Design a binder for this molecule. Sequence first.
Ligand SMILES: *[C@]1(C(=O)N[C@H](C(=O)N[C@@H](C)C(=O)O)[C@@H](C)CC)O[C@@H]1C(=O)OCC
Length: 251
Amino acid sequence: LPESFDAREQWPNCPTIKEIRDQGSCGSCWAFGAVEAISDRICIHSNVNVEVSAEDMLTCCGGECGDGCNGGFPSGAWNFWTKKGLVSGGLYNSHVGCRPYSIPPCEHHVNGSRPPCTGEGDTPKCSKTCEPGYSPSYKEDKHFGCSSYSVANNEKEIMAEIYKNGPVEGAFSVYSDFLLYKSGVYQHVSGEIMGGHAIRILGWGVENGTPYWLVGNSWNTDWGDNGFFKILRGQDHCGIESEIVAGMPCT
Ligand SMILES: *[C@]1(C(=O)N[C@H](C(=O)N[C@@H](C)C(=O)O)[C@@H](C)CC)O[C@@H]1C(=O)OCC
């Protein structure tokens, strides 16, 4: 394996790999990390570009994935993809795809032009219909996964998985000091625990001798390093290597 790897550069024909979404005032990171990586993998393994609907995942999976805006289980999300499939759907108010995200973007622990996020957000309804004007039908717009698996808490295996099959979804414990991240390799040193957080790992590297994972957060682009962040790699820091999940698209 190379010392560094950036899925954005390795798969130039898959722009979803470079995009950063906004989960809004809803604890739907479990769903976002999943649909983002799935969007990447659909492009990687069928090179078609599709913005997989975070809305479809968040609202229609149900108990199998957890509790909607109240948090969920990443591996459960990839299972839904293989069982029920996922329709397309872009950013809030984009009118892109079958089911665009219905929760407004907001400021995540930063100041900006958008309204500040409010932890309190309800899970939208599971509507099995597409926005007006979009074709095909909800059922016909479903994209299915053909496998859903968990990658071992092993740095090399995780790197190999990414290197070969594309970005994966992961999760780690968020402490308050992470909220103010701007640059460099994040290492937890202080702050009360905020809870678990699911994200998308799309690569790795070494900064000033410090090995790290290249991660895409779902708190919009004005948070962190243009929406991305780097976190210590190799020591299961904050459990970043403990809950890696992925899957492969059908044909
Ligand atoms: C993942 C999650 O979404 N976490 C919360 C979050 O992202 N909040 C946004 C609105 C923000 O700007 O902080 C929050 C706890 C993180 C600080 O609870 C879900 C989940 O399913 O976690 C399990 C992996």
